[PDB]
Amino acid sequence: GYDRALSIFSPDGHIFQVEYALEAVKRGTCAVGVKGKNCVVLGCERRSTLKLQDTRITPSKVSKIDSHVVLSFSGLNADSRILIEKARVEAQSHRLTLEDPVTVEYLTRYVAGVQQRYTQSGGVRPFGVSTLIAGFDPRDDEPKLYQTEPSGIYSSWSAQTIGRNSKTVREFLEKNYDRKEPPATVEECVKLTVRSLLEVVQTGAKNIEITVVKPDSDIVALSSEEINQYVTQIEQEKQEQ
Amino acid sequence: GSRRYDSRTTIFSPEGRLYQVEYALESISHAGTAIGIMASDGIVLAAERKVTSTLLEQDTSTEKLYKLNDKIAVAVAGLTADAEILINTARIHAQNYLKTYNEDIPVEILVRRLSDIKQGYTQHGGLRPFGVSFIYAGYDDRYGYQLYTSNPSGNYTGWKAISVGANTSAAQTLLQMDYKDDMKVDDAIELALKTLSKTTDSSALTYDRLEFATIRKNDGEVYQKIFKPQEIKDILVKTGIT
Amino acid sequence: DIILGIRVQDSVILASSKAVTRGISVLKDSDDKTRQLSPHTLMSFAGEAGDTVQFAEYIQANIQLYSIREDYELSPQAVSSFVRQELAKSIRSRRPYQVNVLIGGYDKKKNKPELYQIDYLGTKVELPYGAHGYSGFYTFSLLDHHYRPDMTTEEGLDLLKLCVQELEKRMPMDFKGVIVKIVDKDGIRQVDDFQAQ
Amino acid sequence: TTIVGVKFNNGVVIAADTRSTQGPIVADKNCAKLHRISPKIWCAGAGTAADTEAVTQLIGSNIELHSLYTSREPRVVSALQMLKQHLFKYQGHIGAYLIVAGVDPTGSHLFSIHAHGSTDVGYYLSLGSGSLAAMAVLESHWKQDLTKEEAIKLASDAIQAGIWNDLGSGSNVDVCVMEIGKDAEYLRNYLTPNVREEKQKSYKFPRGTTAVLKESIVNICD
Amino acid sequence: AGYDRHITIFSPEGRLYQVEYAFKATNQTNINSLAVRGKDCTVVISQKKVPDKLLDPTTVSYIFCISRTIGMVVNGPIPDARNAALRAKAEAAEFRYKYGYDMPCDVLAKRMANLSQIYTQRAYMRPLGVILTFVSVDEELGPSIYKTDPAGYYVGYKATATGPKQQEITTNLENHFKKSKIDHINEESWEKVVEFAITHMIDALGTEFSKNDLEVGVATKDKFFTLSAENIEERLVAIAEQD
Amino acid sequence: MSVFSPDGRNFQVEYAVKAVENGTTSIGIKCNDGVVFAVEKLITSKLLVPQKNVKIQVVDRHIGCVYSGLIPDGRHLVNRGREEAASFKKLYKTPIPIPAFADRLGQYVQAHTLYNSVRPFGVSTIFGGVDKNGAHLYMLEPSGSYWGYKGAATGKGRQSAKAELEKLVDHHPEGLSAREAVKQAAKIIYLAHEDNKEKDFELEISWCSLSETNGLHKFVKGDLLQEAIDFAQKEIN
Amino acid sequence: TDRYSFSLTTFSPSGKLGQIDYALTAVKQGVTSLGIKATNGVVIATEKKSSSPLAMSETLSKVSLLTPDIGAVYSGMGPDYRVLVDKSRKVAHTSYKRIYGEYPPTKLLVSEVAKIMQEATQSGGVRPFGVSLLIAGHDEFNGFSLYQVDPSGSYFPWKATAIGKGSVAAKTFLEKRWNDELELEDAIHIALLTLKESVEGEFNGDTIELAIIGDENPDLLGYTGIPTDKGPRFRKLTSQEINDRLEAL
Amino acid sequence: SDPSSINGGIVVAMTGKDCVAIACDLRLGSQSLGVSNKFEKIFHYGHVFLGITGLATDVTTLNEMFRYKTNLYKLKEERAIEPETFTQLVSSSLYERRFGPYFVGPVVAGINSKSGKPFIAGFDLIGCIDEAKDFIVSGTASDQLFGMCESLYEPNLEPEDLFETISQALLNAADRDALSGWGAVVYIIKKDEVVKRYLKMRQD
């Protein structure tokens, strides 16, 4: 029925809609993910505004695709839900015809592929979302982290951030992440993740959420007391002149 | 040249927002206000109906509060007619779930469904989005009493207390001050009414201009009450607004 | 092939024949005719060749999807409601899935074990014990007699073994014995030692 | 079933028995085989009951809608036409043999409709198991130009013929009379010749006769 | 420019300019028609103009026999009028088949008017720039004139006229009916009713007509037909008696 | 394209006419028992193989069509026309009557003035033939308008033709022989060439007479054609 | 084929659904019509404004029966109203009579119509309906209802209201004349009085069209023999019946 | 062989003075094999009761279907659905699958909340309604149920007797059917209340 071309080339070679989709991401809550030696962590800014939320139920920014992979994101919330659902289905389907779960790249390629599809199809606008897929390939202990954009582009990163003020925390991660010595422990990697958020979050502890993924479907969400304990550690260091 | 009239209802603005969604929200800011408050043993819905006339049959006009099923209700802010289309889809999704699984639908599952339906008009079909913001009140056996909101963006979130329509900044501020987590239903009733009374663009808050409902606790089972115009008036007295 | 199931005090026990016969040759004496749908819900199955597994796997996958989406475990009741609902569609389908299943589960909320029998027409019924095909004919007589709702898992395994001896003695097909699995509050595990008890 | 239609000088009348059977069994000893399509167009059916009712109510739903659109009273030919075209499309798989009758602006009418799609016209007609018994009477006593009363007696005698001799039909006689000027008069159980004689003894049981294992109240409230 | 001028959508005034424009296109043939009713017949008169000598005058007509009983006259461009006659004929034929009887003049008018209404709501279709005046001697309502337009409107008339000088002709008849005090030309023969129509047209338009400047359709029970240049003239010679 | 201007007119249809007008000129003449069609074929160059670029089309066996304006549109319409005349014959047995056929095209062309996703035809089409009750000449405009004719013409030299055509109508009230009309139609093509004079032209005449062709549609070729050339060629001076 | 698969009714920066506002404006210009609810019946009415003294007013019905106990009336674009009655009549069967074997209740039918009217706002390539309907009706479990429906598909139940041209004036008039003890006869009388101010021309049983939903009329059923069917509650008045009440007035 | 003979069982309903009664057996067979002695074939929706004999998977589906439909009805109509309306609903619903029907014998039983009238009805698998005012039978022992009800029934029974009549009519019919029995249940319906009782019977 409705097939008008919403994503098309402008005279200088840009596809305006995709760019304006990234703009939506720019206004998303900073999402971040860094890889450890034997783990991967995902941190996520949450607006500080309403002390009136019900945090038990309000959709959380980090989502599981399978038991061994999660997806974080920035941009339009409602668009994200649609990417997640499609992802979890492809996950369950890949097991059903290959008898083995998806590799983090395959899942990513798949999701990025879907994003790409909305830039090149009629009647549809691209996804106003950019993502951070991370996990461990089955029976593998080498950690993985990817990012995808509305364009449909994707690539692997040792550490990455997306969203509002992402520009600033990558600045922090570029100077603070030694490739040769990646946060050995689970604790170092999480600390490093929080520190990069405290440049941007403003009243840190209260409005941060960290999720820790380790090999063999070992994923846990940190309870703010545990996260807060990391924020008091940050004072100590900085509080020494 | 049939393409000259296509308002392109599903595109992004340079800043990265969906014109049509923002504009839908704009008209929602003029709809009569609706409040939602959650207590430890019940939930409360309250709404100012902005269609007001003495000849209007209040005893009948189900304009803002509707029931999706036995344990879930909504409060509407926007185009009544739009909400009704969405309501009937939800009512069914509840019944399809019931039939498939023989358990009532958990409250979030139904919110997420209805919020995706909206998110779609947002990304394809080139149709205007549904001009509705919903407040969901429900109780299931997993998360107990729950409260949610959704808007034309297809985005939904959860709350302890929340408002939609006109004067939400105002209403939301008053809710932060006086809401406490231990609250008891009866307090929420008085808080919702007090709140509307101080945000109404009217000389006074009268029963004729209200719709009120509660979700409460036979035993171990949940009663859902819609107040008739007499009940709202009575309730208005005790509270000390009359 | 033999599909049996019995619900005791704090668990559900499933027995399922290990033979797979195609033609006049027994192609396999080791087949495990089951699938774990969810951490506390197990499903045995018997019926037409491909359909049997194609159905079992389809359900499993679907339940695994529901599990992830909601980050929750569906009650054994809801799973069987869903399963019937599918088999019910099959019957007026172009080509029906001819599969009979047993669904043993442990309801973590209500803390009781539950056993559901559903035949390929979508006939669900909830029982203390069940079977599909002729397995009922030789065993039921004994299960009617000894079965106690307060039985222990050990007591269950004995009454089960006795039912297996009857089948072994009076049933003209060699089914190469059963694989026994137990579903309880701690999940599902397999009794890898039923050759002697 | 035994059904008939008989034309009289100023209109038309139709009649039917009231025995409804499943094989040799009598499911209902008094059901109505007289169906209204429109106030003055009634229809008597035989064959598969669900079909005669569903194909009647359906056409009558449309006939109404048509009458509303066109602002004119519905005609027997419209109801005839719509019926046969439906039945035909279904190649006989809708088991509905009918006698459609009534008055409309163009005068009075009487038609037959077979499950396959064919229709016939006439002054006296019959369908069902009694189709032959009734017709034996009709051929015996129908004359041209008969009064409303002559016609009702005749249509009623043809259904008795059915009731008695035929085992496919029994119980009572229903009649609907459609006179050109007047309102249609549906006379349900116009005849009740078969009343069960008083039983030889009351079978009512001394309370408690029946063993009860357990009791319960049931909850309808909210 | 305005988009609300080009497709079938509301102006801020609550109007459809497209509909209004289609009303203008109806006068584009500068032809007037009129219809009146007898004691048991219905007559329509239309102006016929064949300025070009190269045109076969026998093939120039805005009167159509829709059904055997329904007749239709059109004020507007021939392509759209033909688009309508075809439809109407098709509808007339179908209604017969399905419901067992001849489509009544008023029903066809309602139907054709429902369709006209649709082009008025749907933006992909334009209205037809025509005004259909249907006529018959109905078996229930008797001699009948129902006329539909581009807005989807239709009503029944005692008599009517349509075209550029629609108005002159209309007030002529309104006047005639004040004295008459009735809803029809009290005449037993259709031949005298056709005469009457032609007279009041000559009066209303203030113009004399030859056998070739007119086109006449007539409805009687069971038949709707048109008169020839001869049937017309015989009728035209009769008007030379009193006047 | 389906838009009404405030006046009541449709500008697209009016423009489509412009495209017709600036095309070559074609005409048709109704004779006593048939019809004749002639068309002006401009020779842009010696490169065009003479008398092997046929522009007059045959529908069924008995209907001849000719068009001035956008040529491909004209074929689209003949193609449609051929389908139409075939369905008819398939159902009703008889070959399609001329008026019947004129309306089939009439309705189809009109349909292209109903929507704004569709463009109306860029041609006026002259056509006809013999049916069970006589000869018929028709002309159909981009608007779907069409009427029966005694004579018809359209294109660059239409007034030139129509002037000459009115004169035939007047100086022969009793009728017109099919052979007369062949010759006559050639003259009218030559006089219509005075306007489009800048280039050399080629003539193409087809006819459909009950006596001369049996009701079938056929091209005037060789012998009979050369004399029609002649009649006109030397009458021009 | 269609090409307008996109919405022709869209939100503006201010939050307005332009075309709905414009459709409402078309209804403003419509002829005054109104409804009044009584303890034992509902009444609806409007002025038969005629576009020619040669048209026969009787042929055009502005007051129409949807179901035996429900009736409608409008103000605005007639043709849009006409097609709505056809669609409304059918849905009353397809979505109800044909599955529950009974006519739908008043509030549900009004919903089926709002539903239709809604879709003309949101759907591909269409403008909203240019009418506001008043629907009067009675069902067994709710009693006599009075409903209004706008082009948006919004519907409100009323004790009495008026729409069209003189609407604010009429509702003003009605707001002071109505009360919960009215008897049909009295409401009929008030309706005629409200409509007097809304008419400049002649005012009689031929220039007025007025109908009611009240008692059941066996004389209007068409047949006898069935004791559980008493006739429709919708009853349209004749010119005569009206004038009897105009002398009295 | 016959889809209405695989699983078996029966349902029967009656009317007495100001009340109605509906009863069924509890068997679920798989042909000759007894499978469940707890298969209740009587369901309710608001104050309307429905019995469904026949093919168990269809019985179950229809309950699940009518539950759904009646809820959407209550939500919209704002009231509970009445027996007369429901009966029509069941018939539409069954005829909807005219050429692929559910293999069942439905029985409707309830009292009109408004009119205070006792009402009951029967149907064939394709919807044909029987609204007899005395009794309704259905299933694998429909032949026997007619036998019992015809001899044992009398109008205007008082609930406490109506209970005895229906109970004996079920019990003795079931005991002459190889595929019916394995326990039984009887509902007694009044405007005020509903009482449900399980009966003691032979288990062979």
The DSSP-derived string for G69-124 is: TEEEEEEE-HHHHHHHHHHHHHHHIIIIIHHHSSPPPHHHHHHHHHHHHHHHHHSB
Q: How far is A202 from chain G (nearest CA, A)?
A: 33
**Domain CATH code at residue D182:** 3.60.20.10
Do chain A and chain E touch with ≥3 beta carbon pairs under 8 Å? no
Residues G125, G3 contacting (CB under 8 angstroms): yes
Whole-angstrom distance, CA of residue E156 vs CA of residue E141 = 11
Whole-angstrom distance, CA of residue F123 vs CA of residue F72 = 9
Residue B6 belongs to domain spanning? 1-242
- Is the Cα dihedral G89, G94, G95, G98 positive or negative? positive
Helices A166-176 and A186-197 pack at an angle, to 10 degrees, of 140
Q: What share of chain A is helix, strand, coil (3-state, %, to 5)?
A: 40, 25, 40
Give F28-88 as a DSSP string. EEEETTEEEEEEEEEE--TTSPTT-S---EEETTTEEEEEEE-HHHHHHHHHHHHHHHHHH
Q: How far is G148 from chain B (nearest CA, A)?
A: 10
Residue B126: which of A4, A22, A128 has the nearest Cβ? Answer: A4
Whole-angstrom distance, CA of residue B182 vs CA of residue B65 = 26
Question: F78: closest CA among F67, F87, F89?
Answer: F67
Q: Does H5 touch chain G (CB under 8 A)?
A: no
CB pairs below 8 Å between D and E: how many? 29
**Could you tell me how far CA F156 lies from the centroid of its own chain?**
14
Residues H107, H22 contacting (CB under 8 angstroms): yes
User: Within chain D, what is the greatest distance between any pair of CA atoms?
Assistant: 69
Contact A96 C69 (CB under 8 A): no
Query: CA distances (Å), B16 to each of A24, B152, E109, F144, in order?
Result: 4, 16, 53, 49
* CB-based contacts of F194, cutoff 8 Å, min separation 6: F157, F160
Q: Does H115 touch chain G (CB under 8 A)?
A: no
The secondary structure of residue B2, as a DSSP letter, is G
Whole-angstrom distance, CA of residue F121 vs CA of residue F69 = 9
Helices (H), F93-220: 98-111, 158-171, 178-191
Do chain E and chain B touch with ≥3 beta carbon pairs under 8 Å? yes
3-state secondary structure of C27: strand
Give chain B positions within 8 Å (CB) of E124.
Answer: 2
Q: Identity (one letter) of the amino acid at G29?
A: Q
Contact D203 H151 (CB under 8 A): yes
Whole-angstrom distance, CA of residue F194 vs CA of residue F160 = 9
Whole-angstrom distance, CA of residue D150 vs CA of residue G188 = 48
Residues E51, E205 contacting (CB under 8 angstroms): no
Residues E67, E102 contacting (CB under 8 angstroms): yes
Q: Look-up: residue for tokens 């019905």?
A: G61
Give chain A positions within 8 Å (CB) of B147.
Answer: 54
Could you name the CATH architecture of E1-243?
4-Layer Sandwich (3.60)
Q: Does F3 touch chain G (CB under 8 A)?
A: no
Residue E124: which of G4, G28, G120 has the nearest Cβ? Answer: G4
Contact B95 H64 (CB under 8 A): no
Contact G100 H89 (CB under 8 A): yes
- Which residues on neighbouring strands pair with residue E41, listed in sequence order? none
Q: Identity (one letter) of the amino acid at A77?
A: N
Helices F158-171 and F178-191 pack at an angle, to 10 degrees, of 150
Whole-angstrom distance, CA of residue A26 vs CA of residue A76 = 10
Q: Look-up: residue for tokens 């009860």?
A: D212
Give chain F positions within 8 Å (CB) of G125.
Answer: none
Query: CA distances (Å), A159 to each of A173, A179, A207, C132, D179, in order?
Result: 7, 10, 21, 55, 93
Report how many domains make up chain B: 1
Whole-angstrom distance, CA of residue B35 vs CA of residue D115 = 61
Residue D105: which of E107, E110, E140 has the nearest Cβ? Answer: E140
* CB-based contacts of F115, cutoff 8 Å, min separation 6: E124, E125, E126, F1, F2, G3
Give H109-163 as a DSSP string. EEE-TTT--EEEEEE-TT--EE--SSEEEEETTHHHHHHHHHHH--SS--HHHHH
Give D139-196 as a DSSP string. HHH--SS--HHHHHHHHHHHHHHHHHH-SS--S-EEEEEEESSS-EEEEEEEE----P
Q: Does A122 touch chain B (CB under 8 A)?
A: no
* CB-based contacts of D139, cutoff 8 Å, min separation 6: none
- Is the Cα dihedral B169, B174, B177, B183 positive or negative? negative
* CB-based contacts of B74, cutoff 8 Å, min separation 6: B65, B66, B67, B68, B83, B87, B90, B134, B135, B136, B137
Residue C135 belongs to domain spanning? 1-197
Contact E106 D71 (CB under 8 A): yes
Q: Where along chain H do its domains lie?
A: 1-204
CB-based burial, D49-58: b 16+ in 10 Å, e otherwise:
bbbbbbbbbb
Whole-angstrom distance, CA of residue A137 vs CA of residue A144 = 8
What dihedral angle (degrees, nearest 10) is formed by the CA atoms of F5, F7, F13, F19? -110
Query: CA distances (Å), H83 to each of D164, D220, H80, H89, H164, in order?
Result: 35, 14, 10, 10, 24
- Which residues on neighbouring strands pair with residue H64, listed in sequence order? none
Per-residue tokens: D2:
């035994």
Contact B5 E124 (CB under 8 A): no
Report how many domains make up chain G: 1
- What pairing do the DSSP bridges indicate for beta strands G223-224 and D184-191? parallel
3-state secondary structure of A219: strand
Per-residue tokens: D168:
């496919």
Q: Does E177 touch chain F (CB under 8 A)?
A: no
Give chain B positions within 8 Å (CB) of C59.
Answer: none
**Could you tell me how far CA A234 lies from the centroid of its own chain?**
23
3-state secondary structure of C196: coil
Whole-angstrom distance, CA of residue B210 vs CA of residue B197 = 11
Overall fold of domain A1-241: Glutamine Phosphoribosylpyrophosphate, subunit 1, domain 1 (3.60.20)
Question: C124: closest CA among C74, C60, C80?
Answer: C80
F24 noted as active-site residue = yes
Catalytic positions of D, written as ranges: 1
Query: CA distances (Å), E2 to each of E10, F4, G20, G109, in order?
Result: 11, 13, 18, 38
Please tell me which residue of chain H has the smallest CA distance to G111.
H76
Which residues of chain G approach chain H closer than 8 Å at the C-beta?
A: 98-102, 105, 108, 140-141
Indicate the burial class of A151 (C-beta count within 10 angstroms; 0-12, 13-18, 19 or more). buried
The secondary structure of residue F213, as a DSSP letter, is T
Whole-angstrom distance, CA of residue C37 vs CA of residue H55 = 28
- Which residues on neighbouring strands pair with residue F93, listed in sequence order? none
* CB-based contacts of B40, cutoff 8 Å, min separation 6: B145, B181, B182, B183, B184
Report how many domains make up chain D: 1
Whole-angstrom distance, CA of residue F82 vs CA of residue F93 = 15
Helices (H), chain G: 18-28, 78-92, 98-100, 106-122, 167-177, 184-197, 239-248
Whole-angstrom distance, CA of residue H16 vs CA of residue H169 = 15
Query: CA distances (Å), F174 to each of A10, F168, F171, F207, in order?
Result: 70, 11, 9, 20
Mutate to test the interface with F, among E3, E30, E54, E115 (most CBs of F within 10 A): E54
Cross-sheet strand order for the sheet of G234-236: G160-163, G33-38, G41-47, G208-213, G234-236
Question: C3: closest CA among C28, C33, C41, C42?
Answer: C33
Residues D136, D73 contacting (CB under 8 angstroms): no
**Elucidation method:** X-ray
The CATH number of domain H1-204 is 3.60.20.10: yes
What dihedral angle (degrees, nearest 10) is formed by the CA atoms of E16, E20, E23, E27? -160
Residues F70, F23 contacting (CB under 8 angstroms): yes
Residues C179, C19 contacting (CB under 8 angstroms): no
Contact G223 D186 (CB under 8 A): yes
**Could you tell me how far CA G75 lies from the centroid of its own chain?**
8
Question: D16: closest CA among D47, D38, D40?
Answer: D47
Residues D122, D109 contacting (CB under 8 angstroms): no
| Polymer length of chain B | 242
- What pairing do the DSSP bridges indicate for beta strands H10-16 and H135-139? antiparallel
Mutate to test the interface with D, among E94, E97, E98, E99 (most CBs of D within 10 A): E99
Indicate the burial class of B34 (C-beta count within 10 angstroms; 0-12, 13-18, 19 or more). buried
Question: E34: closest CA among E223, E210, E203, E220?
Answer: E203
Helices (H), chain A: 16-26, 77-98, 104-120, 166-176, 186-197, 224-238
Question: B185: closest CA among B113, B230, B235?
Answer: B235
Q: Identity (one letter) of the amino acid at D107?
A: G
**Could you tell me how far CA A196 lies from the centroid of its own chain?**
14
Whole-angstrom distance, CA of residue A228 vs CA of residue A205 = 5
Q: Does B80 touch chain G (CB under 8 A)?
A: yes
